[PDB]
Structure formats: C-alpha cells, structure tokens
From a paper:
DEAH-box adenosine triphosphatases (ATPases) play a crucial role in the spliceosome-mediated excision of pre-mRNA introns. The catalytic activation, the catalysis itself as well as the final disassembly steps are driven by so-called DEAH-box helicases. They all belong to the helicase superfamily 2 (SF2) and share at least eight conserved sequence motifs (motifs I, Ia, Ib, II, III, IV, V and VI) spread over two RecA-like domains that together form the helicase core. Two RecA-like domains, referred to as RecA1 and RecA2, build up the helicase core. The RecA2 domain contains an anti-parallel β-hairpin present in all DExH-box helicases, which protrudes out of the RecA2 domain thereby contacting the C-terminal domains. These domains are divided in three distinct domains, namely the winged-helix (WH), the helix-bundle (HB) and the oligonucleotide-binding (OB) domain.
A structural analysis revealed that a serine in motif V is involved in polar interactions with one of the ligands in all structurally characterized catalytic states. Since mainly the mainchain of the motif V serine interacts via water-mediated hydrogen bonds with the adenosine nucleotides, we tested if a higher flexibility of the mainchain at this position has an effect on catalysis. We could furthermore structurally characterize Prp22-S837A in the adenosine nucleotide-free but RNA-bound state, as well as Prp43-S387A and Prp43-S387G in the ATP-bound state. Since Prp22 could not be crystallized in the presence of an ATP-analog, an existing crystallization condition for ADP-BeF3−-bound Prp43 was used to structurally characterize motif V serine mutants of a DEAH-box ATPase in this state. The structures of these three mutants show that motif V is able to adopt the same nucleotide-specific conformations regardless of the side chain property. The interactions in the ATP-bound state force the serine mainchain to adopt an unfavored conformation, enabling the mainchain nitrogen to hydrogen bond with the catalytic water. Instead, the mainchain is sufficient for sensing the adenosine nucleotide state at the active site and this sensing function is sensitive to the flexibility of the mainchain. While the ATP binding is improved at maximum flexibility (glycine), the sensing function is completely abolished at minimum flexibility (proline). The lack of a side chain at this residue position in motif V of other SF2 members is in agreement with the findings that it is dispensable for the function.
Numbering used by the authors: 60 to 762
The structure:
Amino acid sequence: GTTAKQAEAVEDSDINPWTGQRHSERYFKILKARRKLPVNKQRQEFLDLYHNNQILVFVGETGSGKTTQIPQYVLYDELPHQTGKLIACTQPRRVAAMSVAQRVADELDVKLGEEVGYSIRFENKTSSKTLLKYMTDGQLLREAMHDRDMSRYSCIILDEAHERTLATDILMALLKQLSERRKDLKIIVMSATLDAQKFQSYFFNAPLLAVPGRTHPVEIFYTPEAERDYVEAAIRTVLQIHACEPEGDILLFLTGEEEIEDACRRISLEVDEMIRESDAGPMSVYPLYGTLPPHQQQRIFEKAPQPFRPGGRPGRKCIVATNIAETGLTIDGIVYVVDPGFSKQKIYNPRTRVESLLVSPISKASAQQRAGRAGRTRPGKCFRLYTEEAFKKELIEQTYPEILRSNLSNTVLELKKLGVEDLVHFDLMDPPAPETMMRALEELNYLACLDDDGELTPLGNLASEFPLDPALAVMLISSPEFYCSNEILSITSLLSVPQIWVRPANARKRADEMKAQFAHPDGDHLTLLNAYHAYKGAEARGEDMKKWCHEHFLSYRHLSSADNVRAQLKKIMETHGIELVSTPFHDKNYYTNIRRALLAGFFMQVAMRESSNSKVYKTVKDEQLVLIHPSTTVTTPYEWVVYNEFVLTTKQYVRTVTNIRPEWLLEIAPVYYDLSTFQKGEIKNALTRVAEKIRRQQAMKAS
Ligand SMILES: Nc1ncnc2c1ncn2[C@@H]1O[C@H](COP(=O)(O)OP(=O)(O)O)[C@@H](O)[C@H]1O
Ligand code: BEF
Ligand SMILES: [Cl-]
Ligand SMILES: [Mg+2]
C-alpha cells in the first residue's frame, strides 16, 4: 500500500531511484510543473482505483497528464512487486509513441532506451534496463502473436482508444479475454473524447475516473459562412494569423501528402510576398505525413525563427500535417490550430475488395482532439473552418471503427494467428454482422486458407503475409504453377487498387481511343496488364508520367500505387522461397496461362451464359442473373467467364470480365466444383456435360 505522498517523496529525492545517479536540475524544473497538472490532484484516487480493480477507465481533458503521468504513477507502484515485467502504453501513431517516450524519459531523468523506451514496427529502442515502454497498438499486437498471454507486461495501458483502430479494437477484445485468464495483469483504457459508459460496460462494468479541468484554455472560433475550397480557406487563415496575431506557431491539418506539399509551397510563396510588402515576420513551413522520412519528421520540433528586427512582428512556424498529429503529440510553441475538418479515412469496397483512402468529414471527437493540440503549454485558440451549426448537427460524434471499414477476411486470418478459435462469438466492442463474419469464413474456407475444422492452413498463413485481399494472395501464390507469376504479380497489384480508367464526361471519345490501345479481346485483366506495361514502358524512356497518364486517360495515383504494391509483393515471395517465372510472349499458351491463373483466386466469381439467344449470364455464387458490363474489351464473350466485380445499378452487371474454359474450373478448384455434392441446377448440368465430354474425348484417343 504505497501512497502518492510516499512516491512524491521519492520523486523529490536527490538520487534517482532507478539509476542511482543524482537528479538533474532539469528534472526538478519539470517535476514542479508536472504537479500542477489536473491528474496530480487525483493521484491517490487513481491508486485507490488501481489497487482494487483489474480494469480501469480514465478520462480527462486534452493535456491533463494522462499519457505522461499515469504510467509513471503505475511505475512507482509496480516495481516493489519484483515481477520483472514491464508497463506498456500504446499510441496509435509512430511519431506519438517516439515523442512521448523521449518526454517521459526526460520526466524520469533517464536516457531514452534505458528505463523508458519505445517499440515500433522497425525499431525497438529498448534494452534490458527498460521498465516503461511506449509502443504502438500494432507493435503490441505483433508481440501478442508470439506471446498470447503477454507474459512480459504487468500493466497494459491502451492510450487513445477513441480512434478505434484495427489494432486497438482487437487488443481490447484480446485483453478482455486475458483478464479472466490472467489476474496479475492490470488494464487501463484512457482517452479524452471517449464513450466512457460504453467502455465501462464492455470491460465487465469497469470503474470510471473522471478528471476535470484544463491546464490552459482553448478558444474555439467558427466561420460564419461555408467555404468549399478548404485548402484556400486554410491558406487564407494561416496568412491572417501571421499578419494580425501575436507570437505563436500554427498547426494546420490537411488530408494527404500531395495536398500539403502544394499547400506548403503556396504558403511560403505568399508569405514571401507578405514580407516584402506588409513588413511581417518570417514563417517557417514544415510538412508532416506518414510517408515522410523520420529525420525530416523530427524537424517539426525545430525552433521558430526570430524576427527580422528587434521589436518587429514575431517569427512563426507553420506545421501543415495530416491526422498523424491529431492525437498524442504535444508540440511546444503551438498556439493556433486551423481545422478544415477533413481527413483521409479508410473505406472498403465490398464488390472489388479494395481498401482505399477517401477524404471525408472528421468527427466531433477528432475536432476536439485537433483543438487539444493547443492549450497544453500555454493558452491557445483553434480556428475551425466550418459552421458551429455544422459542428453540432452535421458532424458525427465518434469516428467509425476501422474494423467495420476494413477487409474482414484479412482480419480473420490475423485473428487466427493471434489464437482466436471462435470468430462469430469474438467479443468485439462493435463487431461486424454475423452474416458478414460467416461470409468471410465461408470464402476463406473455399480458398483453402482455413480448413473444414476452421483452423489456419499454411496457405492461409502465407496469404496473411501479403497486404492483399486473400483471394488475390492465393492467386499470387498459385501463380508459378501456371507459369505466369511475373504477370499475375502485376495483375494482383492493379486489382488491389481502384480502377485506373479515367473517362471524363467532356472527353469520352478521346478516353476510349487511348484505352483501345491497350484493349485485349479475351479479358479485361489483360487490358489492365497491357496498360501497366505501357506505364512502365514510358517510365523507362524518361517521360513525365503525370503528363503521360493524363494524356492516356489513366489514373496516375492508382497506377503508381500498384507499382509500389507490386514491389512489395515481389519481395514477399522472394523471402519465402517462391518461384518467379513467366512464359515467353510468343508461346502458344501465354495468354491462356494468365486466364487460367485468375481462377486460382476467382473461381467463385464465375458466370455462365443461359442461352445462345440471351446475353444474360448466371453467376455461380447465389445464382444471380447478370449482364456483361459495357466497359468490356471482350468483343465476344465465351459461354463461361470469370469476373472481378459485381455491379449493382439499374441493371445487374459483372465488371472486369475474362473469357475462360469451363474445364478449367474442375481442374483448378475441384473442391468447390465437386460435382458429387454440388447444387442441383443448370450450371451443374452444364458442368457435368463438360466433364463427360472430356471423358469421351480422352478415352477414344486412348483407343
Ligand atoms: N514535449 C513536451 N514539452 C513540454 N511540455 C510537455 C511535453 N509533453 C507533455 N507536456 C506537458 O504535459 C502535459 C500532459 O501531456 P499528456 O500527458 O500527453 O496529455 P494528455 O493527458 O492529454 O494525453 C501537456 O499538456 C504539457 O503541459
Ligand atoms: F488527450 Be491528450 F491530448 F492526449
Ligand atoms: Cl482510418
Ligand atoms: Mg495523450
């Protein structure tokens, strides 16, 4: 029963209890400011709730001291038990876990990597001396794959569960099960914008600890009129702050990497025309996105420029960022936050099995977390570029969970690697529908990624290593047996992105003209492969590919993404010892090999023509009646086709269609097309005739 005042006396000591060295003067200056935080008045109320409850819910305002102080409150309590375990705190972003770990190491007067450290995907800045670890939720989930009981941690702190990521929602379900299995494990879930009663009721009616109060206020300013060009409204507001507001840096939130790098250039050019004319101060402009290098990512903590003259307008720092800085980070010197209200949120197309990023409105919880990046070290204000009534009535309260916006079949294979056995009764906080979960289990069993008992096959474990929809990964893994593994490697990448065709309403004719350069009459998949080959062909000549894709009416963003995916997918097969073969182009079976190899992943998406009079096709799965989509490069479709996408519109269509032979269905997928147990119907009768026709064909040639 170690009290808070007992621990404060150790914090006030000259000697570091963790290292045995003398405390620095910087440590005491930080500790004096740490105790003015709103969580410090309730340190004993926290310890009373922590000793008596296994799972704890913590809420407090942005900047209260949740991330920085509570693991140190736990660390002072947990060391006398001599467990040899560690304290784990999860942040959803890599830069947030790195920056906080350097802060808490400074707060504890230790060197980063020793008693306090971080662990991310490709860096583990820990050691034997490490006691507190600030990791990501994905990195803790990767350790849960090899250690399902998490035997290395005595306390798990799930910081910022409000973002509801894929790793966080899974970790909440895993730790809730582990709470019944392990009673020597403590679980803390904390956030500032949280459905606390929902998180309470999920964790076996756990207690709640509410901390009121802010360190510094944040004034919320709204625009009276809606402005559509949010980039123009953002750049206008940043220049207005540098002109007419006192000293203090700006944090700008925009959606994508290309959006801010244009905006970082447009701001710096309009700043330089404010310097020469309006006699304002200098402005440093810094970008921040996820694909940016870390040594340039750490430049956002770089000091504001000084003014040109003593007594002049203040020099300023503008950080234009994505929502990578929405949570967790405390950037010193930020006074102003501009909120356009948009972010790139992951969506899932169920017909094409593609996870893509869409610019969408942020939630109410994201706006408060964005405004909470100020008001931490000094008072601040947030400029929301939207109506107050748009905040109250148009914005949703909580961000939609990532597990409902992701590929469920990819999620299921990761959960089997985590040790989950009952998937339909897995207690997620917001689970998918049981029709949706069983459909993922139905497809993954037919793809041989799961057996009939439901356990993970070695095909499913290997398909989980690829960042693809699992039907595309089975197609890539089976590709060397069809002698077209270099070609399927490109086709899976183009099928993992949205459609590359650009058909504007003002230029339909010129769009179809450039598309017909790549058109293959046997399949749309070969038309995709031809267009990617033309992209990589003009790239080797030295042409401007943005100019090339615009003139050839192709999406540059989707084609360049598939080229980066194909480089990723090519490396995964090389490290796993998979052959990478291709047939020469003038082989008689070059194109038939590629059309055969599509059925290794897409045997379930097959249509059969009903009658010779009709253009209506009937699908194998669920007997749907479809037409061929008019975007097809197939001039005359066969009686049997494979398709990538079911299209529901005023008429039911199938898109990305390739002609196949029905005898390939029995060869490639015999378990699904087992005619012993197949469903009665016209497709079965047509398939048994195909098996009989090749039977009388081969037997008479044996005669
Ligand atoms: N790098 C830093 N530099 C200066 N002050 C910091 C830093 N990190 C945190 N702080 C201070 O500690 C407070 C608590 O931060 P934190 O614990 O992350 O807040 P929250 O509880 O909102 O997650 C901040 O409001 C700020 O006053
Ligand atoms: F809630 Be805090 F801004 F991490
Ligand atoms: Cl997201
Ligand atoms: Mg925090």
